[PDB]
Write an enzyme that holds these catalytic residues in place. Structure first.
Site, PDB file in Angstrom:
ATOM      1  N   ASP A 130      -3.238  -3.171  -2.423  1.00  0.00           N
ATOM      2  CA  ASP A 130      -4.368  -2.231  -2.389  1.00  0.00           C
ATOM      3  C   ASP A 130      -4.293  -1.228  -3.547  1.00  0.00           C
ATOM      4  O   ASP A 130      -3.242  -1.071  -4.188  1.00  0.00           O
ATOM      5  CB  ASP A 130      -4.415  -1.493  -1.047  1.00  0.00           C
ATOM      6  CG  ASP A 130      -5.758  -0.800  -0.793  1.00  0.00           C
ATOM      7  OD1 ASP A 130      -6.732  -1.019  -1.561  1.00  0.00           O
ATOM      8  OD2 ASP A 130      -5.840  -0.037   0.193  1.00  0.00           O
ATOM      9  N   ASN A 131      -5.425  -0.589  -3.829  1.00  0.00           N
ATOM     10  CA  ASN A 131      -5.509   0.483  -4.812  1.00  0.00           C
ATOM     11  C   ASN A 131      -5.082   0.079  -6.234  1.00  0.00           C
ATOM     12  O   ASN A 131      -4.647   0.926  -7.010  1.00  0.00           O
ATOM     13  CB  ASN A 131      -4.663   1.687  -4.374  1.00  0.00           C
ATOM     14  CG  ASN A 131      -5.095   2.268  -3.030  1.00  0.00           C
ATOM     15  OD1 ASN A 131      -4.261   2.509  -2.163  1.00  0.00           O
ATOM     16  ND2 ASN A 131      -6.397   2.520  -2.865  1.00  0.00           N
ATOM     17  N   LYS A 141       2.517   3.540  -5.807  1.00  0.00           N
ATOM     18  CA  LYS A 141       1.946   2.579  -6.753  1.00  0.00           C
ATOM     19  C   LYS A 141       2.942   2.108  -7.810  1.00  0.00           C
ATOM     20  O   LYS A 141       2.923   0.939  -8.203  1.00  0.00           O
ATOM     21  CB  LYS A 141       0.709   3.158  -7.445  1.00  0.00           C
ATOM     22  CG  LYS A 141      -0.381   3.650  -6.500  1.00  0.00           C
ATOM     23  CD  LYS A 141      -0.592   2.729  -5.320  1.00  0.00           C
ATOM     24  CE  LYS A 141      -1.265   3.480  -4.176  1.00  0.00           C
ATOM     25  NZ  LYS A 141      -1.057   2.834  -2.849  1.00  0.00           N
ATOM     26  N   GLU A 153     -17.300   4.288  -0.956  1.00  0.00           N
ATOM     27  CA  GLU A 153     -18.688   4.741  -0.833  1.00  0.00           C
ATOM     28  C   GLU A 153     -18.918   6.250  -0.985  1.00  0.00           C
ATOM     29  O   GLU A 153     -20.018   6.677  -1.349  1.00  0.00           O
ATOM     30  CB  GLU A 153     -19.264   4.283   0.518  1.00  0.00           C
ATOM     31  CG  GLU A 153     -19.666   2.799   0.571  1.00  0.00           C
ATOM     32  CD  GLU A 153     -18.594   1.902   1.191  1.00  0.00           C
ATOM     33  OE1 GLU A 153     -18.099   2.243   2.290  1.00  0.00           O
ATOM     34  OE2 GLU A 153     -18.253   0.854   0.584  1.00  0.00           O
ATOM     35  N   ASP A 201       0.826  -1.212   0.000  1.00  0.00           N
ATOM     36  CA  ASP A 201       0.000   0.000   0.000  1.00  0.00           C
ATOM     37  C   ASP A 201       0.862   1.265   0.000  1.00  0.00           C
ATOM     38  O   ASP A 201       0.440   2.323   0.489  1.00  0.00           O
ATOM     39  CB  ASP A 201      -0.937  -0.005   1.203  1.00  0.00           C
ATOM     40  CG  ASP A 201      -2.225   0.788   0.962  1.00  0.00           C
ATOM     41  OD1 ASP A 201      -2.391   1.414  -0.119  1.00  0.00           O
ATOM     42  OD2 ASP A 201      -3.083   0.785   1.873  1.00  0.00           O
TER      43      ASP A 201
HETATM   44  C1  LIG Z   1       1.783   9.628  -3.169  1.00  0.00           C
HETATM   45  O1  LIG Z   1       1.214   8.383  -2.785  1.00  0.00           O
HETATM   46  C2  LIG Z   1       1.571   7.809  -1.612  1.00  0.00           C
HETATM   47  C3  LIG Z   1       2.350   8.511  -0.656  1.00  0.00           C
HETATM   48  C4  LIG Z   1       2.705   7.911   0.548  1.00  0.00           C
HETATM   49  C5  LIG Z   1       2.299   6.620   0.792  1.00  0.00           C
HETATM   50  C6  LIG Z   1       2.657   5.917   2.106  1.00  0.00           C
HETATM   51  C7  LIG Z   1       4.056   5.361   2.070  1.00  0.00           C
HETATM   52  C8  LIG Z   1       4.818   4.981   0.947  1.00  0.00           C
HETATM   53  C9  LIG Z   1       6.000   4.504   1.518  1.00  0.00           C
HETATM   54  C10 LIG Z   1       7.173   3.982   0.743  1.00  0.00           C
HETATM   55  S1  LIG Z   1       7.605   4.548  -0.788  1.00  0.00           S
HETATM   56  C11 LIG Z   1       8.942   3.526  -0.972  1.00  0.00           C
HETATM   57  C12 LIG Z   1       9.847   3.498  -2.163  1.00  0.00           C
HETATM   58  N1  LIG Z   1       9.058   2.728   0.150  1.00  0.00           N
HETATM   59  C13 LIG Z   1       8.108   2.962   1.096  1.00  0.00           C
HETATM   60  C14 LIG Z   1       8.067   2.219   2.378  1.00  0.00           C
HETATM   61  N2  LIG Z   1       5.918   4.615   2.835  1.00  0.00           N
HETATM   62  N3  LIG Z   1       4.757   5.112   3.131  1.00  0.00           N
HETATM   63  C15 LIG Z   1       1.527   5.413   2.945  1.00  0.00           C
HETATM   64  C16 LIG Z   1       2.257   6.672   3.335  1.00  0.00           C
HETATM   65  C17 LIG Z   1       1.530   5.940  -0.136  1.00  0.00           C
HETATM   66  C18 LIG Z   1       1.169   6.552  -1.357  1.00  0.00           C
HETATM   67 MG   LIG Z   2      -4.187   2.931  -0.061  1.00  0.00          MG
END
Ligand SMILES: COc1ccc(C2(c3cc(-c4sc(C)nc4C)[nH]n3)CC2)cc1
Ligand SMILES: [Mg+2]
Ligand SMILES: [K+]
Length: 219
Positions: free
Chosen positions: A168-169, A143, A198, A140
């Protein structure tokens, strides 16, 4: 210096009960439903996550992208004693929030929080965190990283036959490269779990991909 993530934690600490993971989830869910939207929450999605944990009863779970710890609380509350969750979070402030969230829920002994980028931390799991192979992976985070982190995981030998990936997503905002690969590959047996958003009035979904073992060389 107030942030949405501090406000979520504050709302939990005020309204939930310490050591009660369910009240924590309900608090977060109510907050994000009635006060301000936040990433990576939602009880409908949580139902699917619950069912997956219940069915496979993983002993070792990796989560990519803890954010505020909603999914970490969600999964860790169903984990058996001795079972562990490792969760990665790239933003230090969010990592800090996740830790406090888990502490409040009483699950801090089931969870290790790693603050860093997935591609940096995943190859350290074997050597630093005593991982052999993972039983389940929840994706999650960013993406565009679903596919290369999945390939990285396979590369590092962290996947076994029967390892459950849950992403997810994959529909909103969507992860097309990832979907195409795991569905097209004989190394993953894939199931799609639709889930309605929703209030944004749109169908999103989770993808469950069960690792089947490596693609075998031609004879
Ligand atoms: C802009 O969309 C987003 C922004 C933040 C996030 C979150 C997130 C992503 C990461 C990453 S990224 C990476 C290379 N390793 C890790 C561990 N940690 N937390 C959920 C906070 C999800 C989607
Ligand atoms: Mg999500
Ligand atoms: K497939």
């Amino acid at each position: 210096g107030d942030t949405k993530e501090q406000r979520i934690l504050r709302y939990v600490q005020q309204n939930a009960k310490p050591g009660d993971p369910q009240s924590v989830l309900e608090a977060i869910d109510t907050y994000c439903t009635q006060k301000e939207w936040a990433m990576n929450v939602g009880d409908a999605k949580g139902q699917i996550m619950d069912a997956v944990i219940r069915e496979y009863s993983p002993s070792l779970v990796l989560e990519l992208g803890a954010y505020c710890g909603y999914s970490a609380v969600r999964m860790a509350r169903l984990l058996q004693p001795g079972a562990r969750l490792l969760t990665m979070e790239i933003n230090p402030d969010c990592a800090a929030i996740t830790q406090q969230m888990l502490n409040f829920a009483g699950l801090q002994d089931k969870v290790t929080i790693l603050n860093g980028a997935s591609q940096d931390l995943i190859p350290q799991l074997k050597k630093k965190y005593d991982v052999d192979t993972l039983d389940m992976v929840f994706l999650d985070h960013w993406k565009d990283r679903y596919l290369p982190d999945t390939l990285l995981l396979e590369k590092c030998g962290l996947l076994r036959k029967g390892t459950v990936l849950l992403a997810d997503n994959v529909i909103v905002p969507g992860t097309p490269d990832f979907l195409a690969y795991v569905r097209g590959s004989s190394s993953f047996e894939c199931t799609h779990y639709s889930s309605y958003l929703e209030y944004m009035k749109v169908v999103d979904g989770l993808e469950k991909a069960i690792y089947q073992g490596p693609s075998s060389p031609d004879k």
